[PDB]
């Protein structure tokens, strides 16, 4: 019974080691909005006579 | 065809962990299976026939 406890305690230490890490690479990334209309600013002015 | 097999149980074993440590817990459980762990003396003289 003592040997079973001692070996289990040793096995607990051995199991407590790390394997790897995982994380997501997201910094420096933004979204892209979409603009449908070209912002032209031209306005045409014509006289009443049309000349 | 015929064959003889020694069962002796089946035990899971993992990787990344030292095998000697894992063998310790199975060794104790094996001794329980064979009735070896506690101090003993064999008494098999009377089991016979003529």
Automatic annotation (TrEMBL), chain B:
Transmembrane segments: none annotated. It comes from the Viruses. This is Vp2. It comes from Banna virus. The chain holds residues 203 to 252 of 955 of the full protein.
């Amino acid at each position: 019974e003592d040997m079973a406890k001692i070996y289990g305690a040793v096995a607990a230490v051995s199991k407590n080691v790390n394997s790897s890490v995982t994380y997501e690479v997201k910094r420096g990334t933004h979204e892209l909005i979409k603009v449908p209309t070209i912002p032209h600013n031209l306005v045409l002015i014509q006289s009443d006579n049309g000349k | 065809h015929a064959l003889i097999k020694e069962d002796l149980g089946q035990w899971p074993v993992e990787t990344g962990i030292s095998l000697v440590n894992q063998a310790g817990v199975f060794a104790v459980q094996l001794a329980n299976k064979l009735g070896i762990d506690k101090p003993f003396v064999l008494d098999a003289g009377s089991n016979y026939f003529t």
